[PDB]
Design a protein around this ligand. Structure first.
Ligand code: HEM
Ligand code: HEM
Ligand code: HEM
Ligand code: HEM
Lengths: 159, 159, 159, 159, 159, 159, 159
């Protein structure tokens, strides 16, 4: 059994994306924890875990289709030096995923590979949830003000 | 058994008020949860469930009296785009209920329909609490300030 | 994030459908209860809830896509006056959904909005099951005889 | 270890009969459930499961005697389009089994193959009971009325 | 309700394939058990059971669509006389499913029958997993050598 | 058994450091509790108990080394009069320990007293987490604002 | 609190090795599982998780020291093509760490940063155990024969 080659590139592309996200998300969570925004950092941590799970799932798909999963390649990280830049950085990678996946699923279906399209379909839904979560944080930051918003990310007492 | 025509019409009018309220309140909970005010959102969602229950209770009374429950007619929604706006809109519908129900109760008793009256008295009591809750929130927004009040409506961390 | 306008219009159209179904299904259930078809009534009730859930799900999708959910609009109720009439009425609405959704889905995918599409796919599947049930019920009335079918809808003793 | 050729041919014959039955019985059960006769459908389903076991049992025995089990061959399905037709079709396959097994056992015993004869005797006891159930159901259709009997086959409320 | 005649032929073809597989798989499990490869047989037996489930699922869909499930028609069995022959035989039936379904799902969507399409989309995923397992065992036979692989398919002690 | 003079001198210097800390931290905890900053106050108390254990472990090592633990000397306390002055005052002592134990740890390994050295290494590690926590608290006052950060140190409601 | 710039560069070097190892080890376990060597794959997975943990700890330390953990840089993966190539590759990376760390710790002690040294000493020790396991796996490959070794890496029955 061997996968369609355009599909495999697509998969590997997405995999590379997931790997970048695991790292960006994780380091952001540690940085959030270090700044003392512990309550937020757990959320951000969970996001990295979610991305890690996505990476494993793609990996299995690639392998079943007899491909080589690219563990070498890494994307470019945007590492935020503020909470606001951090959410912004995270937003950008998820948008990059949507931009790649929306066309990609259609291609997968045109290639008669429903299983792959289905996996990509799930990822897209998850990323949408994430983006929605991230944009709402920026919305809140303005509505509450930045300092007030930020106080909601610490614990009582902080750290 | 058959209801007094006037009472059934008052009951139907109240039903339309409930159906209106269920929607306005439910949508507002969805909106507040979506802007990330989740903790407030749970409260609003309950108040909507409360209206669902009233509506069912009015429906039962109507049917008992050989009436036709009107599920077709709906009131004019006031959808707010800030928390304040939302609170004020909900207040408005509650006030219309008191305006309708207060004479309506005195009429039910003249017609000798105590059971419909007691039902309506119960709704009045419930709407008075809601108004007290809403009116208070509005008070707090001023006392605390709007942003600070809003902050108390999000979890830690937010959403 | 922003939804394709057509997709959002589709979703809203479905919402309007759901809101009409909740009311028509609820009303029917209350009436079946009122006639003493308590057993049947509980199933119909459950159907109304399924719709209430479809309404919430669609409402979430719309908010996610920065759409404006329409809780103002409701459709034309078909309130049956016999079980057979109710069954036909309910069927008619379900068929309206299938007629809308089937092309709707194709469109969602062209527009590359899989998440919405999947949301609609589940709904279609759900409505197909509902139509099968109601159509079976009519077959049963014919096969059993109407009165004998109706007896299967009362508790022992009745109500 | 090597079986008698006549015996083995008899077992493969009975195996073909089972395979047929499993298909007929299962479909009929699926058919009764779709009609809304969920209560009868459960029993018929059980009857098919019973036939699955007999085919496994005969399958072991043939294998133990160094035989080739025939899973390629299927007999003529009789699919009923009414409950009465279904009960009759089911009875005919059952009587074909007794007709074959009764001389078939004496043959097994004559050939000095008791274990094989014992397995067949058990199938016969089992088929006799199924036949009694079926013939009784037809008597009940005449005793009760066909519609009234059919009403005994649905839940409350239906499906 | 009434489905597309093409969708119903595809579902019926697939039904034939499922019944063929249930049979080849089950016999193969029994042959492996007979040979003393008990640990392996249990796995094989599960696979035939998985196909029994797919057969039922297809059946429900066909009946929902007012179609007539074909339980009379069977495929051509390939019964293997070695473990290697069996894996290859089973692989051959799976590849065939993939051949049928890959175009058919595209077709099902074209005809706006998402529920039938999703169902087959699921069978594709399952068959893909089963192929992956089967291709792996054959690879394990070359890597380990056949006798050694075979050793891994028996209990301690055997049967 | 006899400790090296230089080492014992170092253990005693540290012991003095620990008693000073116990007092300074315990009083800061009590003052913070007085001020109504009860939630922070609990974390501070815990820091004091940590020091109390450190003193005891040093005392035993000194006793095991035939030394005379100094429970008569104390350093100067910096009692802070705001939350900010307390955090700076605590940090200042923390740094005074690191400055002493860094060269001290090297010296112990030189006189060949690994056990004493490791005891110190642990203290240093512990002391490091303490500094990072305090240095993070001061940043948060800047980031959140002093009034806001302080509101994260009280309970709901205050004390 | 600022770490020594040399120590920080070392921590970052090691982080780089850890990210490299996490990927290699994870891919290798995914590949082994794929080949059906399930039993070995689980251990290999556990190894990758260990480096995931190493990575996290080193990250805290750099953050504690006001450092910037490099999650951008990854090293050359050596992906193995047989169980043997896989063991030999993972070994090579492990040896690279002992090489880097042996002098780094000494350096850390000189710059007087024991807590960093201690973390590294703990990595050096775990790495030794890993090397000893892998070295032993190769040895058993010779003692048993590659085929026989491999047979102990699969379950009964395989995958
Ligand atoms: C790149 C830096 C990474 C960091 C800092 C990291 C960190 C962690 C940590 C600390 C855990 C908890 C596991 C345990 O307690 O043993 C974990 C879980 C896991 N990681 Fe990673 N990891 C990284 C990369 C990866 C990659 C590239 C993969 C590829 C799949 C991966 C796969 C997993 C999986 C499958 C889990 C368990 C998820 C679960 O518990 O549901 N990790 N990670
Ligand atoms: C947009 C309109 C509505 C929406 C979104 C909505 C949504 C919901 C939901 C999500 C539930 C919880 C269901 C569960 O148990 O999982 C519910 C409950 C209920 N609904 Fe509705 N519903 C709506 C309209 C109505 C209407 C018109 C009535 C008519 C009287 C009604 C009657 C009820 C009742 C009686 C409950 C049980 C309340 C409780 O105890 O929590 N609902 N609704
Ligand atoms: C080749 C002849 C077949 C044999 C020998 C066979 C055998 C069996 C056996 C032994 C069981 C377990 C029975 C029990 O619990 O009492 C079973 C279960 C089942 N059978 Fe069959 N069967 C056959 C064909 C079929 C067919 C045609 C269908 C219908 C399409 C079917 C559907 C099922 C289902 C749905 C289960 C339960 C599945 C589960 O629990 O995982 N089987 N079969
Ligand atoms: C200078 C003022 C001090 C104050 C106000 C103080 C206060 C306290 C108090 C109230 C307890 C709880 C007692 C109990 O549970 O019965 C405690 C526990 C303890 N104290 Fe002190 N203490 C001081 C100094 C010290 C000193 C100098 C040492 C050792 C040299 C010390 C060692 C300990 C230890 C080891 C505990 C055990 C509680 C635990 O951590 O499990 N304390 N202290």
């Amino acid at each position: 059994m061997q996968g369609d080659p355009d599909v495999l590139r697509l998969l590997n592309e997405q995999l590379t994306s997931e790997l970048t996200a695991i790292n960006q998300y994780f380091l952001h969570s540690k940085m959030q924890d270090n700044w003392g925004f512990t309550e937020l950092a757990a959320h951000t941590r969970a996001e990295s875990f979610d991305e890690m799970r996505h990476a494993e799932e793609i990996t299995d798909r690639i392998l079943l289709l007899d491909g080589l999963p690219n563990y070498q390649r890494i994307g470019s990280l945007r590492i935020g030096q503020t909470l606001r830049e951090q959410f912004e950085a995270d937003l950008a990678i998820e948008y990059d995923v949507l931009n790649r996946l929306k066309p990609g699923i259609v291609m997968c279906r045109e290639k008669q590979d429903t299983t792959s399209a289905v996996l990509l379909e799930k990822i897209v839904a998850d990323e949408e949830e994430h983006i929605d979560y991230l944009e709402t944080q920026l919305e809140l930051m303005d509505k509450l003000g930045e300092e007030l918003y930020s106080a909601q990310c610490v614990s009582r007492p902080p750290t």
